[PDB]
């Protein structure tokens, strides 16, 4: 159930000059790397103890890569401005997401390589790793350029071999925290609303991994439409938080049951107020 993902953010500034280049790298929901072009001497930064044991020479190589990407996204943003017949005036965004989902053995389950320009899909590597999906006419230019260059075939070697070898090294290096599941700490809170209503709130706290879903059931029936759900939030210690809420009649609370499914939970929990 493990994946390595890399997230790149390139933001142009009005007129000319260097764009803003941000690179984040994650192993599931645990970040191990940051790069920020906004530094007079930019460097690769380790965000997890398991990559800190990795050689200082490995740390120069990561920096050179992101320094190559930052230099490359300036020309990418420049080209797209021309694909969209846009001026140097005004800030634009170019995002790339690439990475690997680990299979049941030490094989690639799925490979990703996709782009967004101003937060609209641009081009995506298809599941076969041989093909691309262009969203507009502009992206079809990148696509015809990419199909001629055989970019997909070239990018295949990294997703399949390299991305996998590294996720595996990181999973062995961080086996203590990366390879374990921390179950949520469940409880229910009751909050009267009126003479005829009351909010029933099911909290899930201190869990790892993220968004491993809660539910409210009225007499065995899942409340898929009446459930007030908050987005899964980082606690800030590597753990996550989420709650599920439901407004219920005055004295009917007993019909409502909260369900929790988590890989750290050997059995789906049922709880009431």
């Amino acid at each position: 159930s493990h994946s390595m993902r890399y997230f790149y953010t390139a933001v142009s500034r009005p007129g000319r000059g260097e764009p803003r280049f941000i690179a984040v790298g994650y192993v599931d929901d645990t970040q191990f790397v940051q790069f920020d072009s906004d530094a007079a001497s930019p460097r690769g930064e380790p965000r997890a103890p398991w990559v800190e044991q990795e050689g200082p020479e490995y740390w120069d190589r990561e920096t050179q890569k992101y320094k190559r990407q930052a230099q490359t996204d300036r020309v990418n943003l420049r080209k797209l401005r021309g694909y969209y017949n846009q001026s140097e005036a005004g800030s634009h965004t170019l995002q790339r997401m690439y990475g690997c989902d680990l299979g049941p053995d030490g094989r690639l389950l799925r490979g990703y390589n996709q782009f967004a320009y101003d937060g609209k899909d641009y081009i995506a590597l298809n599941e076969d790793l041989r093909s691309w999906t262009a969203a507009d006419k502009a992206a079809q230019i990148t696509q015809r350029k990419w199909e001629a260059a055989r970019e997909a075939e070239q990018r295949r070697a990294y997703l399949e071999g390299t991305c996998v070898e590294w996720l595996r090294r990181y999973l062995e290096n961080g086996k203590k925290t990366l390879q374990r599941a921390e179950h949520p700490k469940t409880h229910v809170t009751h909050h009267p609303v009126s003479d005829h209503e009351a909010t029933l709130r099911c909290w899930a706290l201190g869990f790892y991994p993220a968004e491993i879903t809660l539910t409210w059931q009225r007499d065995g029936e899942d409340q898929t439409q009446d459930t007030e759900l908050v987005e899964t939030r980082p606690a800030g210690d590597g753990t996550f938080q989420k709650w599920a809420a439901v407004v219920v009649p005055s004295g009917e609370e007993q019909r409502y049951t909260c369900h929790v499914q988590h890989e750290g939970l050997p059995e789906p929990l049922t709880l009431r107020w």
């Binding site: 190559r68 490359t72 990418n76 797209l80 390299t162």
Partner: peptide
């Protein structure tokens, strides 16, 4: 480890 050669579109 990041992908070595950058993607030019």
């Amino acid at each position: 480890s990041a992908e070595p050669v950058p993607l030019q579109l």
